[PDB]
Symmetry: D2
Subunit: 355 residues, 4 copies
């Protein structure tokens, strides 16, 4: 278990950006800019800095050309410049490796702290960032599939309770989780900004990055991304969805970038900012928990996820989950799920829902 | 081949209603009224008569209590009263069994002809119907999942070219179909009213009714039906979708009523009313033909469909398809499909997507 | 206007309009760059445009000329022989006709243009060059995509006279607006089984009130508004967005660079049954035009496009003598109601929502 | 100028509910429940307690029968029980009248402080509230016009800068405002919860309550409210809209309840939770600032607003605005508005946009 520092936690505002290492910057540009319509804040031959429609900070996504596709940093913005000092002291007390650069690691970010966190993930904390033109009323640019905000990250980690306690001490509040009747936790969602999540934990071998999620305004915007992918004859890069989530109540879609980094498109979850916000726990065998309509979750959603880097840019070693596998217990050969608790009718034994 | 009668074909306007036999009227009522929000035009202890939001004829759906769930009649409205006489002469010349009721078979329909058609389906033709309040601006009644029009029927039949030619002789025009390079036809869609379909043929064992389809105004109305079914903890009755179709380009959902009658919810196909409307043929192995997003088609969608009745109310015997099976050639052990033709990447062999 | 002995042509639908525009590049910016229509052909003289779901060559031809005006409103007929029928029909009416075996505009074949009994330049054609139907080209689809041509709307001084003539041509009236003392202010009529393929608005005419395109959904119309705000051309949004009473469609009216009015429209209802119930609204009903009761801007009633004769000269305008919809509803002696018979929610001598005429 | 207290400001989470006095409880219930679809948490012969689709606290709106329709309280939830004490101390230091009820003023609220604030408005601060069933996935109940959240209040007050500074000291951050080139502020918007607004100030005679705002998921939900009001033949109760706002970038509608309390329906503003969120200032003469599409702002929007009560339940006296009037300077006789700054084309002199004048 991860101890609670004496040192005060930094005041974290929200998830702010991810830096993803990609192998072919032009193929990645085509996906994120031409297919998905993200806005270029800055680009050169090594990196593309992208932002969503409503963002005013420099970027929400940094694509960095490199030899091995992986997450290099998941960044959270903190409330004040002095919260970057707080973050540094906090992670030092945790005995984590840290690195601080007063002029930032990427363009458009100033004084920033990167850490290898207790779960093996590269977190950044920053306040200072270069403001850019907020494009929120640039309806002359607005795409039928427009991505309007960065919403969250999702992390694969082998021991969810261990990770949950650490994130709670950091000030994240759990909104929803998935457990069973035998004391296992399979997933948890937690926030700072008053939505269902800024980050989330999915039980599995880790550290790996499960996905980065962007918001749309409306459900038809997500439908348009699917339709466009069909027209481009790249429907094979649609992994799962579109659907309605149980957990989060959001309308969603999962797609795969050219290096198989998973992107979620997400809309219309609910407000969580009250400190006694009711926590919702789903049973792992409830077939409406992930897709509310009961559509089956493809095995790749559970098994595939991106590598993460340490502060030297090397791939973090993967530690195997020993807790029960959500895949195995719901859709594996001895799996089970139900539509109605206690009802044999609409239940699934050793197979996924819908045939 | 079904010969073309010398007698003139009835001028068919559109699909108008289906009469479905149901086993438990109250359970059916709960599904079609409380879950789906159809509007009651009449009911008693034996039948419920229902219509969509924008309809002015008496009904689009009749639920009739009976011992065996089945399609009892798929009804088309014809342009004039004389077209019912034309229908009678046409089907008589085809050698089909017919029954004429000058005062109708169901309430709110007048002079009507029912036939056991050459594919074994119970068709009704009528002009006369009781007009009711058109609810198209009754936004005080409008549901988040509102069903606004009856759009089409879909019939399972073993020989699609045989059925197609018969429907063409009746004035239906084919808009889209699915074929392979070997020359097999797997499915065809055909219309009178200037949308992609009023009826459609799915290759399979028949006669069986594949589904009845209703439209919504917008895609979010279809999403809401799914969301409602999740809240009612009946998500197991969502069979397939929601999706974008390849064929028709419509946004769609398939759901199952208490007797396993399949209902499609549909929106935003295209105009087909010009007589040289371009006909679109998809290859059966194209994994974007049925769901444009490449989502797999569950086997039950190909194998399960409703019984149909003859004019005595007995179940029509089924004839097995001898042409190749769409299920088998796409998702069965020897099947395949592609995302991009000639590309093994994004292709599926012996396996769905 | 007498019913000919000659049979009417079988009209399928409205198909395209040819608009004369004064600055081709400025018009192109509006129809292509702002509105997203798709180019079938263009040169220094003309731009040929189609909607997202169209397979015929075009829905709109922009023709450079000295005086902005409607040059032709074109209806597609069912067969080649229907063009001959249209020629015989209009000749029996005593109208000036001109037949070109190879068309008046590119991508149309054998075509008949007529100066009709109301002064309007109608075209009838069957033959047209098919193009790529873009209906699944979601790689092109804009947030404001115009998906079909829906209808025309004509300003004419005597609505019943026009209505009777269109009925003889096979159009069926769906909705109209009347008062209690026998004046008709507007009528809507169709061939293709929607509310309208053309429509008559009482006023000085012949003038073209608007051409209408459809979207898939209501949000697509909202986006057009939003885009016009971002482009700082909100002054070219004339009226809306709204819900119509008549037609029940969601709508918007915008103005092109020559003040030609374009309606964007969605989700009217099916009218293809021959006994489709007609709907008559009282002119004083403040929900008849905008169902939400929003006021109808006076320019909507007063302004419309010139139309040309077959020589390309402007048709002389004839004044309406029947009562004016503007005057009887929102003028200083006008009135409208929310609930018939109820003084609460009624407006006298001004428009709804607290405005009077500017 | 309202001084900054030495005492620490309470930590405010969000706007939480309004209590409105209504004259005919059954008529008001018809509007809020039968027309708008809000969910009943409790009712009796005297009050109706209502909540939105996604709410878990007891209510977002209390309708209280009384002789004079008015705003009785605009309630903000605070982060901890101790923040109610901080609120009491803060407002006492400001010299404001306060009333503390350990078991609440209304049902489903616990320990609560009501205050006559320095602008004359009845504010409530509370933490304790009865949780109820959160209906966020009850799609069996979901209306085509569903109101999903309470979003904000908007207050009419004569001196906007004075109010703005007081709210900033209380920890609200201004997201957008409307000013001119002569030093006048006409309106300001300010938040705690990380949306454009939890409350907002509109220049005019006050204190009066301009509106309470609820959100929908999507724009079509707002369209449906309008459609339904047409079907119910109460389109006269649609005051303004629907539209796209300039300020907030939200899609919006204003409607009027049976006592002429104004309700806004709103959707799809943007995130403001970063502390250096860029403040957007619109010029008062920009004809896209209130309605982005340039539609004219109905004069009642500027002139009409609800009475507010003091802690005794008496109506607060109105103080006249002496700063320039937004109505007068934009759509009045000597008014002016533009579409494009510096362009005469698309400008309006002494009248409203789109061909209208003041009635
Ligand atoms: O592409 N298909 O699966 C189709 C297309 C249209 C239909 O109405 C349908 O039921 C199936
Ligand atoms: Ca000035
Ligand atoms: Cl999920
Ligand atoms: Cl109108
Ligand atoms: Cl405003
Ligand atoms: Fe996620
Ligand atoms: Fe179908
Ligand atoms: Fe129109
Ligand atoms: Fe507001």
């Amino acid at each position: 278990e991860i101890p609670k520092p004496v040192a005060p936690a930094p005041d974290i505002l929200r998830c702010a950006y991810a830096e993803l290492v990609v192998t072919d910057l032009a193929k990645s540009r085509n996906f994120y800019v031409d297919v998905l319509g993200l806005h270029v804040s800055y680009e050169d031959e090594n990196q593309i800095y992208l932002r969503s429609f409503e963002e005013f900070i420099h970027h929400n996504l940094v694509l960095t050309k490199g030899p091995v596709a992986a997450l290099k940093a998941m960044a959270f913005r903190v409330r004040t410049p002095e919260d970057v000092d707080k973050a540094e002291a906090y992670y030092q007390e945790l005995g984590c490796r840290t690195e601080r650069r007063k002029d930032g690691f990427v363009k458009g970010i100033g004084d920033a702290l990167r850490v290898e966190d207790p779960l093996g993930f590269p977190y950044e904390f920053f306040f200072e960032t270069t403001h850019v033109e907020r494009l929120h009323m640039r309806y002359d640019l607005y795409s039928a599939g427009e991505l309007v905000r960065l919403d969250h990250f999702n992390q694969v980690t082998p021991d969810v309770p261990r990770g949950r306690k650490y994130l709670e001490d950091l000030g994240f509040r759990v909104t929803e989780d998935i457990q069973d009747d035998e004391g296992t936790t399979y997933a948890a969602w937690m926030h700072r900004k008053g939505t269902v999540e800024d980050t989330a934990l999915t039980g599995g071998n880790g550290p790996r990055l499960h996905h980065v999620a962007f918001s749309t305004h409306e459900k038809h915007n997500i439908i348009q991304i699917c339709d466009k992918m069909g027209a481009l004859r790249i429907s094979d890069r649609i992994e799962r969805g579109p659907g309605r989530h149980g957990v989060s109540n959001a309308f969603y879609l999962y797609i795969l970038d050219p290096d198989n980094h998973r992107i979620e498109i997400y809309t219309q979850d609910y407000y969580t900012g009250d400190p006694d916000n009711p926590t919702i726990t789903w049973n792992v065998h409830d077939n409406q928990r992930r897709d509310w309509w009961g559509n089956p979750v493809v095995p790749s959603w559970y098994t595939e996820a991106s590598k993460v880097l340490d502060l030297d840019g090397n791939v973090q070693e993967i530690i195997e989950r020993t807790d029960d596998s959500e895949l195995e217990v719901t859709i594996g050969a001895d799996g089970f799920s139900f539509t109605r608790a206690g009802d044999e009718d609409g239940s699934y034994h050793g197979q996924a829902s819908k045939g």
